[PDB]
Amino acid sequence: ARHLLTEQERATMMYYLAQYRGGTISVEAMVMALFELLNTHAKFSLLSEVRSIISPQDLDRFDHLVLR
Amino acid sequence: ARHLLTEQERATMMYYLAQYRGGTISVEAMVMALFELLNTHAKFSLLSEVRSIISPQDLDRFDHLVLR
């Protein structure tokens, strides 16, 4: 599950690192793409893991804050 | 090394989750603190791991973009 999530994001990181090392994208473009990727990982871990210990009356507030 | 980094951040996450579940902090305050924590983890992984495959002429540009 999480390892399959990790593998998909590492394959995406590698796609951007390869474009960078191949000289098709700039270092700035590459760093911004990695940050976008890591931000999606952060939001997804909060929704799939941290959410489990949130009190039921706060579940709606938590989901909107995490996604927005 | 990385496991000692992981343990320190998990102890910080637990501090905020405990304050939340104890009712001392709001769900919003807790989510914003977790996001700050995860953002520092993202920036630190880019500087300690991704940096290793950056071309030497881009190392200065990479460090400033990651930190700023």
UniProtKB/Swiss-Prot annotation, chains A, B:
Phenotype on disruption: Mutant mice for isoform 1 appear viable and comparable to their wild-type littermates in growth characteristics, reproductive performance and general health. At 2 and 9 months of age, knockouts show a profound hearing loss across all cochlear frequencies. At 28 to 33 months, they show signs for retinal degeneration such as a thinner photoreceptor nuclear layer and outer segments shortened.
Tissue-by-tissue expression: Expressed in the retina. Colocalizes with RPGR in the photoreceptor connecting cilium, a thin bridge linking the cell body and the light-sensing outer segment (at protein level). Detected in the inner ear throughout development from embryonic day 12 to 20 days after birth. Displays a dynamic pattern of expression after birth, demonstrating an ordered appearance and fade-out across stereocilia rows. Isoforms 5, 6, 7 and 8 are not detected in the retina.
Cell location: Cytoplasm; Cell projection, Stereocilium; Cell projection, Growth cone; Photoreceptor inner segment
Function recorded in the entry: Involved in hearing and vision as member of the USH2 complex. Necessary for elongation and maintenance of inner and outer hair cell stereocilia in the organ of Corti in the inner ear. Involved in the maintenance of the hair bundle ankle region, which connects stereocilia in cochlear hair cells of the inner ear. In retina photoreceptors, required for the maintenance of periciliary membrane complex that seems to play a role in regulating intracellular protein transport.
Subunit structure: Forms homooligomers. Interacts (via C-terminal PDZ domain) with MYO15A; this interaction is necessary for localization of WHRN to stereocilia tips. Interacts (via C-terminal PDZ domain) with MPP1/p55. Interacts with LRRC4C/NGL1. Interacts with MYO7A. Interacts with RPGR. Interacts with EPS8. Interacts with CASK. Interacts with CIB2. Component of USH2 complex, composed of ADGRV1, PDZD7, USH2A and WHRN. Interacts (via PDZ domains) with PDZD7; the interaction is direct. Interacts (via N-terminal PDZ domain) with USH2A (via cytoplasmic region). Interacts with ADGRV1/MASS1 (via cytoplasmic region).
Disorder named in the UniProt entry: Defects in Whrn are the cause of the phenotype whirler (wi). Mutants are characterized by deafness due to malformation of the cochlear inner and outer hair cells and by circling behavior. Stereocilia are shorter and wider than in wild-type animals and there is a decrease in the number of actin filaments in inner and outer hair cells. The number of outer hair cell stereocilia is reduced with increased spacing between them.
Protein name (database record): Whirlin
Upper classification of the organism: Eukaryota, Metazoa, Chordata, Craniata, Vertebrata
Gene name of the record: Whrn
